[PDB]
Structures are given as structure tokens and as C-alpha cells.
Amino acid sequence: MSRLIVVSNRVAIGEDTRPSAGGLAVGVMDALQETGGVWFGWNGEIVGTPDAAPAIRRDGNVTYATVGLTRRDYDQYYRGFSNATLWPVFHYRGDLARFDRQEYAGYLRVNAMLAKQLAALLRPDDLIWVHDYHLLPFAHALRELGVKNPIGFFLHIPFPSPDVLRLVPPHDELVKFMCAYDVTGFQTDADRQAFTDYIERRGIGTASEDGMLHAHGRVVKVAAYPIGVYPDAIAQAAVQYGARKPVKMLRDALGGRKLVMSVDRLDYSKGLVERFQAFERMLANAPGWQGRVSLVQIAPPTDVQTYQRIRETLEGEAGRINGRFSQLDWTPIQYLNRKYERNLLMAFFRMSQVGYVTPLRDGMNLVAKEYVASQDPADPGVLVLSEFAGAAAELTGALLVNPYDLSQMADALERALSMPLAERQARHEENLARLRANDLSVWRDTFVADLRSVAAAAS
Amino acid sequence: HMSRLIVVSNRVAIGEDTRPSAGGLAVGVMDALQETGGVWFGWNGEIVGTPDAAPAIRRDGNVTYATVGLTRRDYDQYYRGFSNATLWPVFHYRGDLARFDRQEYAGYLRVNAMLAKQLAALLRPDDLIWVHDYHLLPFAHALRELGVKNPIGFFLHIPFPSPDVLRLVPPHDELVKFMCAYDVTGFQTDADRQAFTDYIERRGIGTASEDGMLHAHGRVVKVAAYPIGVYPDAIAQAAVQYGARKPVKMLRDALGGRKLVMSVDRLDYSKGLVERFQAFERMLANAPGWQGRVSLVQIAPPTRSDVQTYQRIRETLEGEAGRINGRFSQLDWTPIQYLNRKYERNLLMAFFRMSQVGYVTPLRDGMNLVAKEYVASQDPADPGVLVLSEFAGAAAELTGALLVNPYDLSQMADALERALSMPLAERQARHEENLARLRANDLSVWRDTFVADLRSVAAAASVTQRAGRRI
Numbered sequence: 017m018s019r020l021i022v023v024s025n026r027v028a029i030g031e032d033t034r035p036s037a038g039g040l041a042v043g044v045m046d047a048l049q050e051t052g053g054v055w056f057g058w059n060g061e062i063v064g065t066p067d068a069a070p071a072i073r074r075d076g077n078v079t080y081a082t083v084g085l086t087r088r089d090y091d092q093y094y095r096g097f098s099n100a101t102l103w104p105v106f107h108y109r110g111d112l113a114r115f116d117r118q119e120y121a122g123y124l125r126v127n128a129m130l131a132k133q134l135a136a137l138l139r140p141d142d143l144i145w146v147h148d149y150h151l152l153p154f155a156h157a158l159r160e161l162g163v164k165n166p167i168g169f170f171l172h173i174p175f176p177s178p179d180v181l182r183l184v185p186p187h188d189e190l191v192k193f194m195c196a197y198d199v200t201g202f203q204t205d206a207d208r209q210a211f212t213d214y215i216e217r218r219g220i221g222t223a224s225e226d227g228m229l230h231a232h233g234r235v236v237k238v239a240a241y242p243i244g245v246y247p248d249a250i251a252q253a254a255v256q257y258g259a260r261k262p263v264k265m266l267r268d269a270l271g272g273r274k275l276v277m278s279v280d281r282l283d284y285s286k287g288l289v290e291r292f293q294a295f296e297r298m299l300a301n302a303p304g305w306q307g308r309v310s311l312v313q314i315a316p317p318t319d320v321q322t323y324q325r326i327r328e329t330l331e332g333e334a335g336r337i338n339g340r341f342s343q344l345d346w347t348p349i350q351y352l353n354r355k356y357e358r359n360l361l362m363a364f365f366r367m368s369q370v371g372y373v374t375p376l377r378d379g380m381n382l383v384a385k386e387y388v389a390s391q392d393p394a395d396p397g398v399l400v401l402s403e404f405a406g407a408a409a410e411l412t413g414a415l416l417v418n419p420y421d422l423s424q425m426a427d428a429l430e431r432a433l434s435m436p437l438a439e440r441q442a443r444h445e446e447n448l449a450r451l452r453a454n455d456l457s458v459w460r461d462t463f464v465a466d467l468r469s470v471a472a473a474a475s
Numbered sequence: 476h477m478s479r480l481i482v483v484s485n486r487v488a489i490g491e492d493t494r495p496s497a498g499g500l501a502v503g504v505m506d507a508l509q510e511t512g513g514v515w516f517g518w519n520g521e522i523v524g525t526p527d528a529a530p531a532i533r534r535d536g537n538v539t540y541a542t543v544g545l546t547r548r549d550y551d552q553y554y555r556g557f558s559n560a561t562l563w564p565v566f567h568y569r570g571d572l573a574r575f576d577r578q579e580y581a582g583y584l585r586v587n588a589m590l591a592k593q594l595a596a597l598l599r600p601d602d603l604i605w606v607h608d609y610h611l612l613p614f615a616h617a618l619r620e621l622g623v624k625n626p627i628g629f630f631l632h633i634p635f636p637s638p639d640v641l642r643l644v645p646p647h648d649e650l651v652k653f654m655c656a657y658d659v660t661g662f663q664t665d666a667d668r669q670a671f672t673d674y675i676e677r678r679g680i681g682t683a684s685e686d687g688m689l690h691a692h693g694r695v696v697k698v699a700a701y702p703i704g705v706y707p708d709a710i711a712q713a714a715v716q717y718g719a720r721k722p723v724k725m726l727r728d729a730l731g732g733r734k735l736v737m738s739v740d741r742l743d744y745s746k747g748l749v750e751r752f753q754a755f756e757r758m759l760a761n762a763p764g765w766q767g768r769v770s771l772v773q774i775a776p777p778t779r780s781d782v783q784t785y786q787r788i789r790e791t792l793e794g795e796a797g798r799i800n801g802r803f804s805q806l807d808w809t810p811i812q813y814l815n816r817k818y819e820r821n822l823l824m825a826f827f828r829m830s831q832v833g834y835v836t837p838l839r840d841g842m843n844l845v846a847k848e849y850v851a852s853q854d855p856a857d858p859g860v861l862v863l864s865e866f867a868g869a870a871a872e873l874t875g876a877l878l879v880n881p882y883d884l885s886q887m888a889d890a891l892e893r894a895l896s897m898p899l900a901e902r903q904a905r906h907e908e909n910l911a912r913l914r915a916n917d918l919s920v921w922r923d924t925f926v927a928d929l930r931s932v933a934a935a936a937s938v939t940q941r942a943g944r945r946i
């Protein structure tokens with residue numbers, strides 16, 4: 017069969033290929049194995065001059081084709097247009113966007129540079145699957161090199177409505193790049209419709225009866241493929257890690273007090289000051305909960321200036337809140353800037369009574385799904401979920417909140433902590449059924465099936 | 476005889492100018508109030524200790540002015556609460572500036588309900604009611620709760636955001652229910668109209684019928700765009716009439732033959748005034764031959780109301796002007812004249828006519844009448860060039876402007892340079908293109924079409940109210 021060629025930010029190396037490490041590898045590895053495929057991308061290293069060609073490593077049936085990045089290439093890929101302009105606008109934080117023509121040129125340049133590195137490895141029937149917004153121009157660069165392969169794109173972050181997308185000055189050129197793919201996939205129907213609205217309402221193209229989009233002289237399959245999880249594997253890990261030292265230490269320190277879990281990387285889409293302040297407001301509104309519940313916020317370390325500014329802000333907010341309420345043997349907010357292995361987080365989730373997942377905007381949010389899947393069905397926790405996370409379209413048993421009303425989040429936390437078992441179980445089973453009906457293999461299998469349909473129609 | 480038009484808005488000003496060259500809501504509605512012997516209801520601009528028992532009644536010719544004072548508490552809940560802290564920033568696509576507060580939202584509903592009860596006692600059954608802008612969005616719903624069955628129309632003067640952005644307002648569903656209490660809901664542009672329609676249709680609230688009406692919340696709503704225009708011939712005449720005034724002569728002498736870029740904005744976060752200044756700076760850096768040969772005049776009529784925002788923006792702009800003037804100024808050249816001053820309207824038109832470029836690039840604007848006033852002021856024998864933000868409502872009409880994305884400073888700088896050097900023939904082609912649009916949608920079109928749609932509501936209700944023989 018035709019090889020699957022995965023193109024992404026970072027090729028998983030070594031221990032990062034274990035399913036317990038999560039990440040893109042667990043999503044694509046079965047398909048790479050089935051097809052004898054190739055995973056192409058960065059090796060995580062900075063090199064003094066550009067690599068002549070990708071380094072080649074084979075593990076069983078899968079080939080890993082990796083390059084280093086020079087300082088300039090790294091800066092143009094990670095510290096330029098994609099994170100200064102695309103990321104904030106697509107997360108509805110365009111007040112933070114800063115467009116720069118030279119950075120945009122560098123974004124195009126590094127994409128063309130990587131496409132040139134990949135093209136020499138391709139067989140004409142390889143199925144190419146490109147992941148996320150740093151690589152949006154990748155198919156277009158391949159088309160300019162004469163690549164006629166099936167190419168698919170999956171966008172892991174939101175796609176904004178046309179009014180918001182236009183905050184990115186080259187929006188029309190970006191949409192042209194997205195039409196260089198044969199398949200363009202999004203997390204949710206709302207993302208898919210935003211892209212379709214841009215094409216249709218600006219007179220760029222039309223939807224045919226089959227649902228395909230005809231735009232920029234090409235025919236594009238446009239669909240939503242919401243990324244799920246493996247709920248049975250998560251539940252098993254949640255159980256298996258319940259006696260590990262970090263879990264026991266938290267269990268012991270809580271002394272039977274209730275636990276709210278929250279896990280986020282530090283960026284301005286997460287609303288973490290709001291997260292802390294709504295927990296503060298809950299304790300002020302219902303002081304009977306003081307001394308009886310703690311919030312644990314975990315942030316894996318990761319823009320050095322943005323990360324450090326948020327971390328200092330949150331350290332100050334946690335310190336202020338704790339100074340207002342803390343008692344003997346009670347810390348209201350435990351803010352941990354640490355990387356725990358995924359399976360430990362699942363054990364933390366299972367122990368907790370509330371999962372507090374309220375980003376201001378999120379393309380999906382896998383923590384919300386992992387939280388549900390970790391719960392003991394005989395005593396399950398309650399998910400409090402932002403309506404602006406993609407997962408909200410699926411997790412209909414969550415307590416949904418608009419994080420722009422701090423009192424809504426405070427009210428939801430109080431309701432979650434007080435919820436009778438029978439309702440917690442009804443909501444849990446409702447969410448778990450949805451997780452089981454759209455597990456991670458659905459994303460992989462349906463997207464690959466659509467790439468194969470391109471090839472079938474091609475022949 | 477015809478039914479009274481009842482205008483409901485923020486402020487009833489005594490004896491405001493309503494000549495065609497004038498500005499303000501009065502010039503937009505006065506002809507309709509005079510023609511129908513109507514009533515203008517709203518605030519008298521005064522603070523009172525306790526709520527007014529009933530509105531004061533003043534007649535001027537054929538028009539009645541029905542006004543109340545506001546207590547400090549009512550003033551704060553109307554002007555310094557939910558409308559300006561939450562609605563205004565979200566509708567201008569600045570969710571990051573919004574600060575929702577439940578008690579402020581309750582206060583917004585409360586003052587609308589209070590004002591509606593004051594109006595209701597003055598109504599006759601056939602009155603046509605026309606409510607203006609976002610501070611009064613819940614007004615029809617409050618009237619309906621009082622049993623008012625009159626035709627009621629709403630016109631939103633600011634943008635209406637797409638549903639993904641509207642949902643940043645936590646009570647968005649209730650606000651849209653309020654908007655469906657109107658028989659007519661009018662917007663500045665087709666995009667605003669479509670954003671509202673998108674909310675209704677895609678969220679399963681209601682449906683569009685064949686005639687384009689919206690069926691939602693048990694009501695039938697006419698949803699349409701009525702872009703607000705100006706009287707361009709009146710503006711041009713006023714500009715010429717003021718061409719000899721001392722300040723015009725003063726400015727011309729101060730320029731010393733230099734080209735003039737004009738910009739006039741109130742200070743708020745939708746205007747992008749930092750970007751405005753920085754793109755002018757970038758143009759002077761990119762095309763240094765323009766140094767000493769062009770000046771930017773930025774006029775910002777003071778609006779000390781919302782003191783924190785006004786002072787913060789003013790401080791930021793003073794720093795930017797200080798930096799840019801420090802970079803480029805010479806012995807006899809101030810690159811950016813930044814004037815926190817109020818000028819007579821007709822003087823501004825004369826300044827527009829003198830200038831070569833109108834620089835109107837807000838980050839977001841429901842319409843922007845300065846852009847239309849700029850074009851209307853030009854001498855067609857040597858007309859200036861309008862540089863216009865694509866996020867201003869007027870961009871849908873002023874197709875002869877150099878349209879720019881104000882988030883792209885280099886594009887704005889390039890447009891300024893192109894505008895300043897544009898050959899006469901192209902300047903005239905663009906000017907006449909824009910002027911023809913202004914003349915085909917002058918301010919009377921807004922007034923006449925909206926009032927006609929209110930009258931159509933009344934006529935339809937009359938048709939279904941009877942089935943028996945007539946004549």
C-alpha cells in the first residue's frame with residue numbers, strides 16, 4: 017500500500033514514542049506502522065548550518081526522517097509570524113497579534129526549505145499528512161515543486177470566523193495555501209464552517225453537491241475530525257498509577273479534603289488569573305468550603321518572556337489568595353510548575369472531585385477528555401468546561417461555563433463540589449459514551465480514509 | 476394625517492443645529508419628527524437628586540421634547556456600566572477589554588425598564604417608536620412587558636459582531652431575545668445584518684422566511700441594513716463658506732506649502748491611533764523625501780467621560796507623538812500636530828478641503844462619518860485621497876478609497892505615500908466614484924427607508940386585523 021508521510025513540528029524520538037507519552041505519536045503511529053510510513057520533521061536540535069538532507073532512522077516498519085534547524089530557521093519557525101500573528105488571532109487574542117512582513121517572509125521561507133527537504137524522499141503515491149499552523153504553507157510549497165501527491169492538512173487550533181481571520185493581513189494568501197491541500201481538516205464543525213464561510217461569502221469558491229469546496233482552481237475536501245482519546249487506556253493508567261509517590265503525597269497532604277484539578281500550559285489563551293480568581297470567589301461566596309477543598313494547578317514548563325511573565329503573575333495571585341484564606345494544614349491554591357508524566361496526571365484526575373478546564377479559547381482540549389476518562393464510575397468527578405473549548409461540542413455532561421463571567425465559574429465550582437452521586441454518574445456516563453464513540457482511532461482512520469479517497473479518485 | 480414618530484435616544488438637546496451640513500442624530504431625525512408631529516424622548520443632560528416623577532414636556536414648532544433627568548445612580552448604570560464596560564468593547568471586536576459584571580448588567584436592564592415606563596404613559600396606540608443604539612437595546616422588550624403593541628424599530632449605530640465574538644458577552648442569548656422584541660432591527664452594514672441572522676439561524680433560535688423576515692422568539696422581525704450617510708453637497712458648501720476663516724488661514728500659513736494629512740478621532744480603543752501615528756512614522760522613514768514636505772494633523776475632540784480610558788489613550792498618544800516628532804522634527808517642521816481640541820464642524824470641513832489626504836483607519840467602526848465628511852468636503856478640481864480601514868462600515872460604500880488593514884502598518888505607510896503622490900486623474904476618478912455613492916445614499920435615505928419600514932409594519936398589522944369589506 018501507499019506510505020503515510022506525517023509532517024509535523026517534532027518527530028517523536030526514543031521514550032517519546034511510548035503511548036504513555038501521548039502527543040501526536042499515539043495519534044499517527046498505528047497508521048505509520050500499517051503503511052510502512054515516514055515521519056518527517058525537526059529532531060529538536062539546533063545546527064550551525066542547514067542539514068544537507070534528513071537523517072534516516074528505521075524502527076521496524078517506520079522511517080524517521082529528521083533535520084536540525086539553524087538558529088535563523090528556528091527563530092523564523094517558532095519566534096516569528098506563526099506565534100506572533102497566527103496563534104493569537106486564531107485564539108481570539110488578536111489584541112496580542114503583531115504582524116511583520118519580514119517575519120511572514122521567513123515563515124514562507126522555512127516552509128519552502130522544509131518542503132524541499134521532504135520532496136526528495138517522496139514516492140508519487142505517498143499520502144502526505146501535514147499537522148497544524150506552523151506548517152500551513154507546506155502543501156503550497158510542495159505544489160510549487162511539482163508534487164502531485166494527495167496532501168492533507170489538520171489544524172489542531174481553532175479556525176476563526178472571517179471577521180476575526182482578517183486581523184491576519186495575509187489572510188487571503190493563507191486561505192489560498194489551505195486550498196493547496198486535497199483534504200483540509202479542522203477540530204470542530206464551527207472551525208470547518210468558518211473556513212467555508214470565508215471561501216463562500218468572499219466569492220473565492222463554491223460548495224458542490226458532494227460537499228467539496230472548489231476554490232483556487234482546486235477541489236478540496238473540507239471536514240471536521242475532532243481529536244479524541246483512548247478512554248479505556250486512560251482509565252487503566254489512572255488506576256495503575258494511584259499509589260505512585262507524587263499521588264500518595266498529594267493524597268496525604270489533602271487529609272481527605274476535596275480536590276480540584278487544573279492542568280494548562282502557560283499562555284494567554286488559558287485565562288489562568290481568571291481560573292484562580294473564580295476559585296477565590298467561590299471560597300468567598302461559600303466560606304463553608306474554606307479548609308475543605310484545594311485547587312491544584314499544574315503547568316508544564318514551556319516564548320521565554322511570555323512564559324515567565326505569566327508564571328510570575330500566577331505565583332503572585334496564588335500567594336495573594338492563599339494569604340487571604342489559608343489555615344493550619346490547608347493551602348487553597350497549589351500551583352505547580354512541573355512536568356509530570358501523563359499517567360500520573362490521570363491518577364490525580366481520578367482522585368479529584370472536579371476537573372477545572374476553562375480556557376478562554378481552545379481548539380479541542382484533551383485534558384478535558386482525559387479528565388472524564390480517568391474517573392471511577394462508582395464515584396466520578398465533575399468536569400467544569402469552557403464553552404470556547406472545542407471539546408464542549410462533545411462533552412455535553414460537563415458543567416459548561418463562559419469564562420468571561422467569573423461568577424459563572426465560581427458557581428460551577430460550588431455546584432460541582434456539591435453534586436449528588438446520581439447526577440455525577442449520569443453526567444459522567446453521558447460524557448464517557450461520547451468519548452467511546454469518537455476515540456482517537458476515529459480521527460486517524462477517517463482522515464487517512466479521506467486521503468486514500470483522493471488517490472482513488474485520482475486513478 | 477400620519478402617526479407620530481417617537482424617537483428614543485440617549486440625549487435630547489435643545490435647539491441643536493439641524494441644517495443639512497450639521498451633524499448629530501438631530502439632523503438625521505428632525506425632518507421626520509417635524510413631518511409627523513412626533514416626540515423625541517430621552518435624557519435632558521441633567522443630574523437630579525431623586526428620579527423625575529414624569530418627563531418634562533417642551534414644544535418647539537410641531538415637535539414635542541419629552542425629557543427626564545437621571546440620578547447619579549441611573550447615570551452610572553446607563554453610561555458607566557454594562558453598556559460601555561461589556562457591550563461596546565465586544566461589539567468593536569475587543570473581547571480583551573470587556574469586563575462583565577452581573578450587577579452592572581442588572582442595572583442596565585433596570586434603567587431601561589425605568590425609562591420605558593416613563594415613555595409608555597405618553598404613547599398613543601398608533602405611534603411609531605424608533606429606538607437608537609446599544610445603550611437602549613432592551614428598550615422594546617421592556618415596552619412589550621408593559622403591553623405596548625406599537626411598531627417599534629431599533630437601529631444599531633455600532634457594529635454587530637459575529638456569533639463567535641458576540642458570545643463573549645455572557646448574556647448574549649438574552650440580548651438577542653431583546654433584539655427580537657423589535658418589529659424592525661436595523662444595522663449599519665450587510666455584514667452586521669448577517670452576523671445577527673447567523674446567530675438566529677445557526678443557533679436554532681429562528682428561521683428566515685421567503686420574504687427575508689426572521690421568525691424568532693414568537694415574533695416576526697424585519698432585519699435590514701440602513702447605512703447612515705451625510706448631505707455631501709451641504710458639506711461641500713459649508714467647507715467653501717468657511718474657507719476664509721482665520722484658523723484656516725492660520726493652518727495654511729503654518730504648513731508653508733507642505734502637504735496636509737488630516738485625521739479626526741475621539742479617543743477610544745477602536746481607533747488604532749498608535750497604529751495611525753506609527754504608519755506615518757514608517758512612511759517618513761521609508762520615503763525620506765517626504766520629510767519636511769508633509770504634516771499629519773490629528774484632532775481628538777476631548778471626551779473626558781470615561782476618564783481612565785481617555786487619559787490612558789491620551790498619554791500613550793502623547794508619548795508616540797513625542798517620539799515621532801523627536802525622531803523627524805526640524806527647526807521649522809513638526810511632523811505630527813496632535814490637538815486635543817474641539818473645533819467647529821464647518822471649520823473641520825474647511826480643513827478637510829485644504830488637505831490632500833484623509834487618514835481614517837480605525838481598527839473597527841460601525842460606519843465612520845468622518846470618512847464620508849472628508850470626501851464630501853473635497854474640491855472636485857483637486858480632490859484629496861481617502862485612506863480608509865477595511866473594518867470601517869463605510870468601506871462597503873467608499874470603493875474609491877485606498878482601503879487598508881490597519882494591523883498592517885507597512886500597508887498603511889505605503890497607502891499614505893501613494894495617496895500623497897497620486898496623479899490628479901486618478902484622484903478625481905476615485906473622488907467621483909465615492910461622491911456618487913454618497914449622493915445615492917445621503918442621510919435622507921436612512922431616515923426615509925427606516926420610517927417607511929416602520930409604516931409597513933403598521934400597514935401589515937392593519938391588514939390582518941380586518942377581513943371584512945371596505946370601500
Ligand code: NA
Pocket residue numbers: 365366367368369370391392395396397
Ligand atoms: Na474522581
Ligand code: NA
Pocket residue numbers: 827828829830831853854857858859
Ligand atoms: Na483637498
